[PDB]
Structure formats: C-alpha cells, structure tokens
Amino acid sequence: XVXXX
C-alpha cells in the first residue's frame, strides 16, 4: 500500500 504493503 499501490506503491508494490
């Protein structure tokens, strides 16, 4: 967290 957490 869409950084890819």
Distance CA 1, CA 5 (A): 4
Distance, in Å, from the CA atom of 3 to the CA atom of 1, rounded to the nearest integer, reads 6
What is the experimental method? Answer: NMR
Q: Which string of DSSP letters, residue by residue, matches 1-5?
A: -----
Cα(3)–Cα(5) distance, rounded to whole angstroms?
8
N- to C-terminal Cα separation, the chain? 4
- Residues listed for the chain: 5
Tokens 């890819």 found at: 4
Question: Residue 1 and residue 4: Cα distance in Å, rounded?
Answer: 7
